Amino acid sequence: ALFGYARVSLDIQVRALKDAGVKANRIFTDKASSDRKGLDLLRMKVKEGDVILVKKLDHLGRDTADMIQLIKEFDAQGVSIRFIDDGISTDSYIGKMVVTILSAVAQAERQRILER
Amino acid sequence: ALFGYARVSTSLDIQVRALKDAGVKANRIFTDKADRKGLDLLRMKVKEGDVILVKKLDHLGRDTADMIQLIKEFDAQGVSIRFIDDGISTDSYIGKMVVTILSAVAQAERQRIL
Amino acid sequence: ALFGYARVQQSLDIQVRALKDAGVKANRIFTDKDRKGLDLLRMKVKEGDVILVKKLDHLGRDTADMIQLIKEFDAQGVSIRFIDDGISTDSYIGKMVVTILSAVAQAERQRILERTN
Amino acid sequence: ALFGYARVSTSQQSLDIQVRALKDAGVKANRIFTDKADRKGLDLLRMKVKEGDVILVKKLDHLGRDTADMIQLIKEFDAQGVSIRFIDDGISTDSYIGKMVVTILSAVAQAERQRILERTNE
């Protein structure tokens, strides 16, 4: 089954997931600052063969460590994640490597700006 | 204009079925097991503007360097590659970013050894 | 203070000699064959300390575990230096570089595993 | 030859921390070039460097105003055969790691520009 995840501007993500063909009862959301309600519900409901659509790489984990763990868990469950805006999926080991690289790069930029 | 390539280390029907399901004609699908024979046949048939479909990034080369080399030589003759499961085309700005990230990785691995 | 950590017997003995030759005192070297040595390291280590590791591949069991270990030690004010890779977790760029190289090592491992499995 | 470069937006305090760190890493006082953002010290530096030279910089973030600027400056010096050593990060631009970081960051920056162009074009 096809799922969607969105996190905070949420309507920009939610409408985008719906227009990607995710049904409403399969869209889970978190208002980030229990920042994990929706994601925990998604982690529970997902099963082997399922697909999760995420608008952006940044909307998954709250940092690179968190995102790498989530990808590990979903992959272990036999669930692939596709990032709509980034145009990449976790559906191959090269794919996962690139996603991890991009998260790491995006994390570094946040930290540079935070020090600045 | 639409071609297909499948490769295994050792089955092979999973990739071919995916290529067929993406609209590649059976006579445009070339395969390899374990040595360049099917990839060679594909080289002689493809033309500027054509697109070669592949199931995953994982399936193209023997390793990352080899895959990058293949991408770049098909790119030299105006031929792009679409990786189905990854949802990535080498001729898009994302595909180009990915190939450059992979080239960086492969060069670093090479320099590391030295 | 300078500590050493090695995960894997001969390849563990190569790593230990390498850490000693890198300047780590024998009694500050901790090893694992799952995490008995790491649990001991966690207890001795204090703010401003540095852990030496021969290769990136020898800290965690996978990328998720390694980044988590780094996050944890960083939170204690303990940095990690990888001898072979020539990089430390001191700055956010070092951490970024270490994440990248782990992702690369992991991909290679998965590439090896599939051509075997 | 060994040079140093320090750059700030406005804060004098961090410029002094940078210059001090540069001296402490062994750059001669007459070999430190500075800017208060601009490019005055950088333009002077460019006249003085030659193939083989090394420029110390405190942190990656003290070279350019942003990532895209930093990458362009690294590539400019690199084409001259001049490398940059970032002290706090422990990375040289001419190592396999510095080369990898520069290439990966320029790939990402290039994708973001392509992204803007597509939104502009459509």
- Nearest CA among A47, A54, A2 for reference residue A30: A54
Q: Which residues in chain C have their CB less than 8 angstroms from residue D84's CB? A: none
Distance from C-alpha of D35 to C-alpha of D43, rounded to nearest angstrom: 10
Q: Which residues in chain D have their CB less than 8 angstroms from residue C87's CB? A: 90-91, 97
Distance from C-alpha of B52 to C-alpha of B6, rounded to nearest angstrom: 10
How do strand A80-83 and strand A51-54 relate by DSSP bridges?
Answer: parallel
**Which CATH superfamily includes the segment(s) C1-117?**
Resolvase, N-terminal catalytic domain (3.40.50.1390)
Neighbours of A32 (CB within 10 A): 13
- Nearest CA among D114, C75, D59, C96 for reference residue A106: C96
Reduce the DSSP state of residue B32 to 3 states and report it.
strand
Assigned fold of D1-122: Rossmann fold (3.40.50)
Q: Taking a C-beta distance cutoff of 8 angstroms, is the pair B61, B70 a contact? A: yes
> Residue A9 catalytic?
yes
Distance from C-alpha of B39 to C-alpha of D74, rounded to nearest angstrom: 39
Phi, psi dihedrals of residue D48, rounded to the nearest 5°: -100, -25
Neighbours of A67 (CB within 10 A): 25
Q: Which residues in chain A have their CB less than 8 angstroms from residue D105's CB? A: 105
Do B94 and A101 count as a contact with CB atoms less than 8 A apart? no
Q: Which residues of D are catalytic?
A: 9
Q: Which residues in chain B have their CB less than 8 angstroms from residue A99's CB? A: none
**Which CATH superfamily includes the segment(s) B1-114?**
Resolvase, N-terminal catalytic domain (3.40.50.1390)
H or E element that contains B83? strand B80-83
**Residues of C at the A interface, defined by Cβ within 8 angstroms:** 62-64, 67-68, 71, 92-93, 95-96, 99-100, 103-104, 106-107, 110-111, 114
Distance from C-alpha of C115 to C-alpha of A10, rounded to nearest angstrom: 42
Reduce the DSSP state of residue C5 to 3 states and report it.
strand
Measured between alpha carbons, how far is residue D50 from residues B99, C4, D30, D70, D77 in Å?
33, 40, 16, 19, 9
Distance from C-alpha of B6 to C-alpha of B14, rounded to nearest angstrom: 9
Technique used: X-ray
**Residues of B at the C interface, defined by Cβ within 8 angstroms:** 9-10, 58, 63-64, 105, 108-109, 112
Please, which residues have CB within 8 angstroms of residue B99's CB and are 6 or more apart in sequence? B68, B71, B72, B90
Measured between alpha carbons, how far is residue B83 from residues A88, B19, B42, B87, D79 in Å?
10, 10, 16, 6, 35
Assigned fold of A1-116: Rossmann fold (3.40.50)
What residues does each domain of chain D span? 1-122
Reduce the DSSP state of residue B14 to 3 states and report it.
helix
Would you call A95 exposed, middle or buried from its count of C-beta atoms within 10 A (0-12, 13-18, 19+)?
A: buried
Interface size between A and D, measured as CB pairs under 8 A: 11
- The secondary structure of residue B39, as a DSSP letter, is H
- Nearest CA among D4, D61, D2, D12 for reference residue D33: D4
Q: Name which of A88, A101, A105 to mutate to probe chain D: the one with the most chain D Cβ atoms within 10 A of its Cβ.
A: A105
Q: What is the largest CA-CA distance in chain D?
A: 53
